[model samples]
Target: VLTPLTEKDYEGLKRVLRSLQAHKMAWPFLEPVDPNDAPDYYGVIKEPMDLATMEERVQRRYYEKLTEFVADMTKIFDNCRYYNPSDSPFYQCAEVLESFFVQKLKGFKA
Candidate 1:
């Protein structure tokens, strides 16, 4: 889980989501920035789930299943438990983001 973000930034992100929802925006955020400059985040293409069966619905598109897909995929990250040797790069990226996020989110301190 992310370290608790500033009430301001957290609310700002939520506001962005709400605006997107109101406008029915389903595209991923894709600004042309350096990957090295990217935030520590995870993105995955997962099979959608059916509420009745709770099974993957592979035929669905992201926009058609955005809510369920986002929820399920985020659940995967929330419960993530693996740290394979191959994940060193991923770990480093997360460290960088965590550091940046902390620096940006700091409150007054001595």
Candidate 2:
């Protein structure tokens, strides 16, 4: 049941990533969230995710379905909110990026 996505499909996902990662608020999610900076982060956010990892994963055919892709994309924001307080600037950035990405994903699904 693990059918891989076509190259075209991967490109479609990458297109979304290009715009989502282009945002001013997208800096933190663009690369790995360093655990050395925040010791408790690794303890809570076990499965860390980032735009670079996602784009690479798509190229590797690592995602089997849209849900898998969604899971990884959402993980970045979820981890942000979980690790930082709701009033924190990082949390606000995550909120904005999540909304922006969700809008793009909805259109992409169409």
Candidate 3:
């Protein structure tokens, strides 16, 4: 009965996710941070999240609201900032993409 609201919300969330996937800095966040590449990554980022995971979740309509979808989005940034040094390019990209994401959220409503 309440699925109609979710239908529209999923579309909104999916569009934002699509733009995030296309972002130039999105490569690092697209998939799980490979442990072999950064063996220390899993040790620090316990609750890892990524655009690839988020993309699939959105496609599956896993979120119930905009807040839920955006938290997953925010998690990607926070995890990146946590694992990367403040002066590092990855950290800066997290900041940059975070702001870009917020701008998109600003235009989106539940």
* lDDT, each prediction: 0.32, 0.86, 0.81
Candidate 3: TM-score?
0.89
Candidate 1 or 3, higher lDDT?
A: 3
Candidate with top lDDT is 2
Mark the regions of model 3 whose C-alpha exceeds 4 Å error after superposition: 1-5
In model 3, the Cα lDDT at residue 80 comes to 83
lDDT, model 1: 0.32
Q: What is candidate 3's CA lDDT for residue 85?
A: 86
Best by TM-score: 3
Model 2: lDDT to the true structure: 0.86
Q: How badly does each model clash, as a count of residue pairs?
A: 0, 0, 0
> Which is better, 1 or 3, measured by TM-score?
3
Candidate 1 deviant stretches above 4 angstroms: 1-82, 107-110
Looking at model 1, report the run of 10 residues with the lowest lDDT sum: 24-33
Please write out the lDDT profile of model 2 over residues 1-110, one tens digit for every residue. Answer: 13566677777888988988898999988898887866778888878889999988877889878788889999999999999999989999999999999899998776
Q: State TM-scores per candidate.
A: 0.26, 0.88, 0.89
Model 3 gets an lDDT of 0.81
